[PDB]
A paper describes a structure:
Using limited proteolysis on the cytosolic domain of yeast Pex15, we determined that Pex15 consists of a stable core region (aa 43–253) with disordered N-terminal and C-terminal tails. Without these disordered regions, the 25 kDa core was readily amenable to crystallization, and we solved its structure at 1.55 Å resolution. The core consists of 12 α-helices that fold into a compact, curved structure stabilized by a network of hydrophobic interactions. The crystal structure of Pex15 shows a single domain that we predicted would unfold cooperatively in one step. Consistently, measurement of the denaturant-induced equilibrium unfolding by circular dichroism exhibited a single transition with no indication of stable intermediates. In order to measure the unfolding of Pex15 by Pex1/Pex6 with higher throughput, we took advantage of the observation that all of the cysteine residues of Pex15 reside within the folded core and are inaccessible to solvent. Guided by its curved shape and the orientation of its longest helix, the core-domain structure of Pex15 was docked into the difference density above the Pex6 N-terminal domains. Building upon the atomic model for Pex1/Pex6 proposed by Blok et al., this placement suggests that Pex15’s N-terminus binds between the N1 and N2 domains of Pex6. We note that the 42 N-terminal residues of Pex15 that are not included in the crystal structure can be accommodated in the additional, unfilled density at the contact sites between Pex15 and Pex6.
Numbering used by the authors: 43 to 259
């Protein structure tokens, strides 16, 4: 449609707030529309992933975004089934999780409620990780899987809990998901660099960044 093309054109120009406001104005931010038009959902998730947060937007747009990424709404449950159901598009699954994180991080004010939703997200994500490495064994998106685990560690365990990075976060996840380390050690981003190797290296770099970057400013 012409109106959908207008939204796409705003996205191409990185007028992301205007893109989302137009989607809201025309009624596209709606699970019923998402189910009937996969590319409308794809645009919505991609645009929301670029927004620093959802807090500076108009009230109507904000309420419609929150309905899609608040974990216990009917619309979020349905959207999650659609996005997590396409195991071939792991990078979009990762965008969706980042959008859920953005709601907890910036739209929630009560730390007790933030913790409550963070724990819910942890279960959703760890359950999905098991599904992915089981159902897509032999057909793993190595780069997407590295990104997924690093969202869990750096955005959820570190950022949402306000907790310093540690290799123990990786080993703890592997003890709850015993299939994980074998999978990640056997898949390679490059010669002699497994996903596990890369994640542990990322954790080490993040530790040094956390310790030193502000000192150097």
């Amino acid at each position: 449609s012409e109106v959908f093309q207008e939204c796409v054109n705003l996205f191409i120009k990185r007028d992301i707030k205007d893109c989302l406001e137009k989607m809201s104005e025309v009624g596209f931010i709606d699970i019923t529309v998402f189910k009937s038009n996969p590319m409308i959902l794809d645009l919505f998730v991609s645009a929301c992933d670029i927004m620093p947060s959802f807090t500076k937007l108009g009230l109507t747009l904000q309420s419609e975004i929150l309905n899609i990424f608040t974990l216990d709404t009917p619309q979020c449950i349905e959207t999650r089934k659609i996005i997590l159901g396409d195991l071939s598009k792991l990078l979009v699954i990762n965008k969706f999780f980042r959008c859920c994180i953005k709601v907890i991080q910036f739209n929630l004010t009560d730390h007790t409620e933030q913790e409550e939703k963070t724990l819910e997200l942890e279960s959703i994500m760890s359950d999905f990780i098991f599904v992915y490495i089981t159902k897509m064994r032999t057909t793993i998106d190595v780069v997407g899987l590295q990104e997924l685990i690093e969202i869990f560690i750096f955005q959820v365990k570190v950022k949402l809990h306000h907790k310093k990075p540690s290799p123990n976060m990786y080993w703890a996840l592997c003890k709850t998901l015993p299939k994980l380390s074998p999978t990640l050690k056997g898949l390679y981003l490059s010669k002699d660099v497994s996903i596990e190797d890369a994640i542990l290296n990322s954790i080490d770099n993040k530790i040094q960044k956390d310790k030193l970057e502000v000192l150097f400013q």
